[PDB]
Structure 1
Amino acid sequence: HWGYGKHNGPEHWHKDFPIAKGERQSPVDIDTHTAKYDPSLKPLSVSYDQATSLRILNNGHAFNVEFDDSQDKAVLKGGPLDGTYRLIQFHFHWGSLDGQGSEHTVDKKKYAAELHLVHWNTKYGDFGKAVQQPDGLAVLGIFLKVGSAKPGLQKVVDVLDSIKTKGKSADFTNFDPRGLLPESLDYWTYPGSLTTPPLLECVTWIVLKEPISVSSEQVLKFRKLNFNGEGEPEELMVDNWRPAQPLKNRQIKASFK
């Protein structure tokens, strides 16, 4: 029964998920002056040309665009990663206001939203096994700021009416996630966790430096979604972000000078 409200939100999660107070929790604030350039970091390899999207689902916490991950079709390699990570889903976190919504922050700055492209390490065979491993997942995080529309996001925005409430899904085939990327693949990286329960410490975070711009109308449509199921009292799906957690014994590395 965890959520983002006053009585079940991030401050409560530790009671059911004690790892909430663990040693490599996410998100974190990215202090740009303290992050260190690592010249040995390889360029990211984002190979999404064969991506096969299947479905979009309102799961009561966010909406997920799901992919066929039963073959190497859309994969993330390189950067800090060893091996091949398959794209399984992407989703967003966003705010009730344009000045909040991202999970990671940059010099304490909050963006309007944050995109998470979730990948799992193929050496572990399936996603469920991968989340039990310290190098099981790689999540590519991309900040959203409000300005010009993102044309590649509009197909997502268009379908949200059909998945307004928790448990609703819709076909969502032939979507190209490459349309959600910024120009640059410069990034920060650090070892972290899932940012929602079960908060498993299985994620290599790769956070892009360059935000994408989305329009006020696009993010407004995110905010019309519901946390609740159909026929239940309406609770707008907004502010579904976890705040920055203590960095503890971690260094954030930068791919760029």
Structure 2
Amino acid sequence: HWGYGKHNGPEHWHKDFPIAKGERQSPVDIDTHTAKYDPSLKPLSVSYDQATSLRILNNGHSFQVTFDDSQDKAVLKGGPLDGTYRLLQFHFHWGSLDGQGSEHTVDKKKYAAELHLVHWNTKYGDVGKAVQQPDGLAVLGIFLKVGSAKPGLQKVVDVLDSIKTEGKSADFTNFDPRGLLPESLDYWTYPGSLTTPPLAECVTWIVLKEPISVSSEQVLKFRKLNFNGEGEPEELMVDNWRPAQPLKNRQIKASFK
């Protein structure tokens, strides 16, 4: 089974998931000087006021907070998107040290972590159908740097001890994902893929230019999670990021000059 170790990590994924070597794989390096400002790009519409969080879960590769997506409650629209995308879950990728952990990079710079808010296109009815479509998903990616604490992240960090190992979940109701957003919604966008198996090429990527700052104590608690299940040899959940993939025949567009 795939993971992030020496013998099952990203360099191995193509054997079970040959699309790993495909034409629109993610993440990528964002070369800021080559990204083209596109004046036709609309502002992002992030409508999270009625979000209903449900559970927080250690899924063996990250931890995720899952939302009620049976209704248009927390939706992404505008920007490069046509139609309405429902928020299903968010999760993070992070490093063993602050100098790595993000999946996307900016002029080769790695951030300490990266937040992914995963949304699916309501015209396909459910996320399983959406992942089979080139415009099925929209992922809002947000970089994390280490500095001041993010108060809106603390409720997440404080419950992680209850989902330390693979397969553990806990109630995580009444969490407001608006507390994870930076001030600016300036973004880069490009067509890409899921960054874990099945690596489906179904994602419109929307990567925010402005990172959020989190404290060293907050990211240190990420790094205490376990890849392993309870009772198994403890392998810290760190460096659960896929490296940048070839851009190939794609252009990254910027919403901002």
- Superposition TM-score, scaled by structure 1 size: 1.00
Deviation at 1:128, TM superposition (A): 0.3
SS of the residue aligned with 2:140?
strand
User: Which consecutive unaligned segments of at least 5 residues does structure 2 have?
Assistant: none
Deviation at 1:31, TM superposition (A): 0.0
Please name the residue that 2:107 is paired with.
107
Q: Deviations over 1:108-148 (max 9, x none)?
A: 00000000000000000000000000000000000000000
CA distance in 1, matches of 2:113, 2:166: 20
Deviation at 1:82, TM superposition (A): 0.1
Deviation at 1:224, TM superposition (A): 0.1
Deviation at 1:171, TM superposition (A): 0.1
The size of the alignment, in residue pairs, is 257
Deviation at 1:10, TM superposition (A): 0.3
Deviation at 1:173, TM superposition (A): 0.0
CA distance in 2, matches of 1:212, 1:133: 31
CA distance in 1, matches of 2:11, 2:76: 33
CA distance in 2, matches of 1:117, 1:59: 16
Deviation at 1:65, TM superposition (A): 0.1
CA distance in 1, matches of 2:169, 2:128: 21
User: Which consecutive unaligned segments of at least 5 residues does structure 1 have?
Assistant: none
Q: Deviations over 1:25-74 (max 9, x none)?
A: 00000000000000000000000000000000000000010000000000
Deviation at 1:96, TM superposition (A): 0.0
Please name the residue that 2:18 is paired with.
18
CA distance in 2, matches of 1:73, 1:32: 33
CA distance in 2, matches of 1:35, 1:178: 27
Name the % identity. 97
CA distance in 1, matches of 2:76, 2:97: 32
Q: Deviations over 1:160-219 (max 9, x none)?
A: 000000000000000000000000000000000000000000000000000000000000
CA distance in 2, matches of 1:226, 1:235: 6
CA distance in 2, matches of 1:158, 1:240: 20
Deviation at 1:19, TM superposition (A): 0.1
CA distance in 2, matches of 1:143, 1:21: 25
Deviation at 1:5, TM superposition (A): 0.2
CA distance in 2, matches of 1:170, 1:235: 21
Please name the residue that 1:229 is paired with.
229
SS of the residue aligned with 2:142?
strand
- Superposition TM-score, scaled by structure 2 size: 1.00
Query: Deviating runs (4+, > 3 A) in structure 1?
Result: none
SS of the residue aligned with 2:10?
coil
